[PDB]
Amino acid sequence: GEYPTVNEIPVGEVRLYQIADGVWSHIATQSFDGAVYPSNGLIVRDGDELLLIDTAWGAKNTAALLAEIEKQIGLPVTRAVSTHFHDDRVGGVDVLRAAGVATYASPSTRLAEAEGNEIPTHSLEGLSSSGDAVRFGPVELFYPGAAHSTDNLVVYVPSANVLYGGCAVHELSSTSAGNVADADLAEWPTSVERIQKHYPEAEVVIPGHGLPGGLDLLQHTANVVKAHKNR
Ligand SMILES: NS(=O)(=O)n1ccc(-c2ccc(F)cc2)c1C(=O)O
Ligand SMILES: [Zn+2]
Ligand SMILES: [Zn+2]
């Protein structure tokens, strides 16, 4: 019943968590640079189809994700959006494409190709300036500006007031800015402020890693990033 945690998910299975009517998170774990981390994505019901937000961090995990979706939901995943270029977002795109899923990301998310990561097939125009938003099936995609990465997108589910922050939003227990290798710590608080202004009615906020909460995850993120930079 509780939100599943890193030591509760062996690397290779995937759990789903019901967030709201027609909205689930997916939780997987993966090893990176010798430590194991949980990671979140989103599933949003799209009539009799599903929209997937982010892979489950790797080919095997993403295959397991599709299997878990078939077991627990039983509707086909037809489209996926990756919210930035790192492997916890695009690793598994090749598995999705071979399972009939049309894969999408912004043109900026060029970064996957340059890094040697898997590359979504279709480009999402209309998201190149901070504050841009586009509709994509049952969600709104929002580019808040550089934060965790320069390309990071946010996803809002208006039917349920669910804000999926991806890696630009940290969980409340976070004490650090996470993997900052590709981050912009100077702009990150400004980007979070843009999210706060755009989605004041969000009821659930889902971080890229860790436990969902409410709107406080946004301010908390700004605080831990400012403190990391300052420190
Ligand atoms: N998206 S990513 O760069 O590949 N990634 C992988 C692991 C982590 C991570 C998260 C929390 C933490 F406390 C430590 C690490 C991240 C992240 O910061 O988004
Ligand atoms: Zn990342
Ligand atoms: Zn991440």
Author numbering: 31 to 139, 141 to 262
Copied sentences from the primary study:
Metallo-β-lactamases (MBLs) can efficiently catalyze the hydrolysis of all classes of β-lactam antibiotics except monobactams. Subclass B1 and B3 MBLs are dizinc ion enzymes, whereas B2 MBLs employ one zinc ion. The B1 MBLs are the most important from a clinical perspective and include the IMP (imipenemase), NDM (New Delhi MBL), and VIM (Verona integron-encoded MBL) MBL subfamilies. We report on the synthesis and mechanism of inhibition of N-sulfamoylpyrrole-2-carboxylates (NSPCs) which are potent inhibitors of clinically relevant B1 subclass MBLs, including NDM-1.
The two zinc ions (coordinated by H114, H116, D118 (Zn1), H179, C198, and H240(Zn2)) were refined with occupancies of 0.75 for both Zn1 and Zn2. Crystallography reveals that the N-sulfamoyl NH2 group displaces the dizinc bridging hydroxide/water of the B1 MBLs. The NH2- of sulfamoyl group of 6 replaces this “hydrolytic” water, probably in its deprotonated form, though this cannot be discerned from the crystal structure. Comparison of the Zn(1)–Zn(2) distances in the VIM-1:Zn2:6 and the VIM-2:Zn2:CB2 complex reveals differences. Binding of 6, however, does not substantially increase the Zn(1)–Zn(2) distance, i.e. it is 3.60 Å compared to the unligated VIM-1/VIM-2.
